[PDB]
Structure formats: structure tokens, C-alpha cells
Structure 1
Amino acid sequence: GYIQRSNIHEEAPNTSVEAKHHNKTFYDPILDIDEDLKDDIRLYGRDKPDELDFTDVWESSYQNIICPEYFYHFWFCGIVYSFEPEWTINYPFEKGPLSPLFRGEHALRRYPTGEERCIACKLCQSACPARAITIETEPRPDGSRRTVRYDIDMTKCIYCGFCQEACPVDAIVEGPNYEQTAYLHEDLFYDKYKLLENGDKWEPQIARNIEYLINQPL
């Protein structure tokens, strides 16, 4: 590609018993019997061998009359594979394994003082591949820049996490919650009240996960 290669042939490793990395029992005479079967012409095309034999006669008679497919597979599947313990996770009473990186329901966070982290920078709005975030901003009477509107269409969202990566104050996050099934299409129109209460309810778990994620680079 971008380098030179004087010798393209990769030579096999040293086969001497004196060598340090000699691997005995790599080749098994019982198992490795490919020399017996490699000369068969049936493995190379539609052609037939020069001479058929009574071994083939016996094999065909066994296959056609005994019909082993009804006892080989039946036993070997049914009994043995039924002996194995089950794999089911009892969903109402157990949960499947997640990670702190799991992308679930969106939430808006606060500082430990109770102040909003979001400063209406609109980076999350432009980061959204689905155009699901709409933001409008006015100066709050105390002077700080805050959103007068921050809403996300959860029926447009693809749950990709580009917005939580774009946020420079960790204001918008995707929480661990996934049980957000709704009965109305209007219940999935998330406004600032919904995201704020989601953040105020899920703050401990989100804080723990974000703490671990922050400590990972450190």
C-alpha cells in the first residue's frame, strides 16, 4: 500500500522440536484425516469417481432405509438442548444489563444551587440530526441569558445523544429511563416543564453516571 515489501511470502514458523515454541499435539492423527478425503472428486464439481464402491452402496442404503434424520436430530436436539437452564429475564421483576452510557429519556439539569445549567447557546439545536429541538431565548430580568422556550419533539428524536455531547455545561442529558410509553401523541411533545421535572426526578442516577464518566479520562 504505502510501504515496501521485498518478500511477500510469509514463511511458516520453525517446525523443529528444538525450537522454543514447538507445539506438540497440534496435529491429531485421529482428527486430522483430511488426506483420506481430499482426493474425492465429489468435492470439486458435479463429476463422479472412476469407480464406485460397496462403501458408497452401504452408505446410501443406510441413508435411504434407516432414515437416521428422525432419530439423530430428534434426540440430539430435544433431550440435550432441553436439559439446559433457561435464559429468560423476568422483566417486571428484573432488568436487562445497561451501562452508564445508556441513552434514554431526555432531561434538563441544574447546578447544586438550583440554577439552570442551560445558557441558551443553541449548540444542541444545531447538533440535532432530526431537527427535534426548538429553542427561543430572551434576557431574564436579572440579566442572565435563559431560554423562554426549550422543547423537543420526542417523535422526531432518534435518541442519538449528539445533543448531550454538544452541550458545554452538561445541561441537556439522556437519562436512564426508557419506560416513557404514552397514550397520546401530544404526551410526547416535551416542553421545558417536562424536561425540568425529569431532571429534578432523575438527578441522583444521572449525577452518579456522569461522575463516573467524568472520572474516566482523569
Structure 2
Amino acid sequence: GYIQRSNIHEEAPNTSVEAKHHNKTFYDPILDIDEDLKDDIRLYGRDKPDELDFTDVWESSYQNIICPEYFYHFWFCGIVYSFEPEWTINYPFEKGPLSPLFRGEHALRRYPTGEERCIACKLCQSACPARAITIETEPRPDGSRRTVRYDIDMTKCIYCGFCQEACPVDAIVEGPNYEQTAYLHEDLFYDKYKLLENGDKWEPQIARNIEYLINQPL
């Protein structure tokens, strides 16, 4: 490609008995018997052996008369594999393993004083891949850069967390809330107040997750 190699062949490691990496029991005589079957033309094409053998006749007889597939399958798949423990998770009584980076319910974070973290930089709206985040912002009565409306259409929101990734003041976050099933498609259209309440409900775990994530590069 971009470099030059002289010896095209990559030689196998030296198999000397005195080699430090000489792998004892690398080849097993009880296992490596492929040399016996290395000449089988049937494994290489539609042709058959130049002369059939009593071994082949006996194998075909076992395959056909005995019908041994059923017995072997019942013994292995049923009796043996039925004895393993259950991997099912008690969903109503327990929760599955959720990673810290779980992009859950979109929410609006805030500073510890409670002031709005959103600085109306429009980064979330310019970063929503489907433009699922809508912002309408005007100067605040005190003069702060805050939006008069902040809407997230969950019908068109992929819950991707890109707004959180590109958030300039850590305002938009993806809380662990995943049970956000809505009985109304209109109710699914979350807004500024709804997002603020959702962040208020789950701020603590969100704060712990934020601290842990910041500590990752710190």
C-alpha cells in the first residue's frame, strides 16, 4: 500500500523443540487425523471415490436404517441443553444492565442554582440530524439568552443524544428514563416545561452520570 515489503511470505514461527514459544500439545494425534480424509474427492467436488468402501456402506446404513438424527438431536438439544439456568430477566421486578451512556429521555439540565442551562446557542437545533429540536428565543426580561419555546417532537426525535453531545453548557441531556410510552401522539410532543419537569424528576442520577462521564477524561 503506502509502504514497501520485500519478503512477501510471512514465515511461520520457528517450530524448534528448544524454542521458547515451542507449543507443547499444539497438535493432538487424537484430534489431527485430517490426513486420513485429506484425499476424499467427495469433499472437493461432485465426483465420488474411485471405489466405494465397506466403511462408506456401513456409514450409509447407519444414516438410513437407524434414522439416528432424531435420537442424537433429542439427547443433545433437549435433555442436555434444557438443563441450563434461565437467562430471562424479571422485567416487572428487575431492570437489565444499562450503560452510563444510555441515551434515554431527552431533558433540559440546569446549573446547581436552578437557572436554565440553555444559552440559546442554537447548537442543538443545528445538530439535530432530523431537525427534531425546535427553538424560539428572544432576549429575556432580565436580558438572559433563553428561549421562549423549546420543543422536541419525539415522533421525529431519534433520541440519538447528538444535542447532548454538542451541548455548549450541558443543557440538553439524555436521562435514564426509558419508560416514556405515550397513549397520545399529541402528548408525545414534549415541550420546554415538560422537559424541565422531566429534568427536575431525574436530575440526581443525571448529575451522577455527568460527574462520572466528566471524570472519564479527567
TM-score normalized by structure 1? Answer: 0.98
Q: CA deviation at 1:63?
A: 1.0
Could you tell me how far 1:20 is from its partner in structure 2?
A: 1.2
Aligned-residue RMSD, C-alpha: 0.7
1: CA distance, partners of 2:42 / 2:147? 75
CA distance in 2 between counterparts of 1:53 and 1:165 reads 69
Cα shift readout 1:124-149 (whole Å, capped 9, x = no counterpart): 00100111111011111111111001
> Alpha-carbon deviation of 1:7?
0.6
Q: What is the distance in 2 between the residues matched to 1:140 and 1:217? A: 35
Q: CA deviation at 1:19?
A: 1.2
SS state at 1:138 partner: strand
For residues 63 and 21 of structure 2, what CA distance do their matches in structure 1 show?
45
Report percent identity of matched pairs.
100
* CA shift for structure 1 position 187: 0.7
User: How many angstroms does 1:72 deviate by?
Assistant: 0.5
Report deviation, 1:197. Answer: 0.3
CA displacement at 1:76 relative to structure 2 = 1.0
Whole-Å Cα distance in 1 between the matches of residues 24 and 113 of structure 2? 69
Deviation at 1:182, TM superposition (A): 0.6
What is residue 121 of structure 1 aligned with on the other side?
121
Query: How many Å separate the matches in 2 of 1:99 and 1:48?
Result: 55
In 1: Cα distance, 2:120 partner to 2:161 partner: 18
Task: Look up the SS of the partner of 1:71 in the other structure.
Answer: helix
> Could you report, residue by residue, the CA deviation over 1:8-56 in whole angstroms, capped at 9, with x for unpaired residues?
1111111111111111110101100010001011011000111111111
1:135-186 C-alpha deviation (Å, 9 max, x unpaired): 0111111111110010010010111111011111000111100100011111
Q: Which runs of 5+ in 1 are unaligned?
A: none
Instruction: Give the gaps of 5 or more residues in structure 2.
Output: none
Q: Could you tell which deviates more after superposition, 47-56 or 194-203?
A: 47-56
| 2:65 aligned counterpart, secondary structure | helix
CA displacement 1:96-139 (0-9 Å, x = unmatched)? 10011100101111111111010111010010011111101111
CA distance in 2, matches of 1:64, 1:206: 64
> Residues 52-101 of structure 1: CA distance to partner in whole angstroms, max 9, x if unpaired?
11111111111111110110111111110111111110001110100111
Task: Show the counterpart of 1:89.
Answer: 89
- Tell me how far 1:209 sits from its aligned partner: 0.3
The alignment covers a number of residue pairs equal to 218
Aligned equivalents of 1:9, 1:145: Cα separation in 2: 65
| Residues in 1 aligned to 2:144 and 2:105: alpha-carbon distance in whole angstroms | 27
TM superposition score normalised by structure 2: 0.98
Cα distance between partner residues in 2 of 1:111 and 1:85: 47
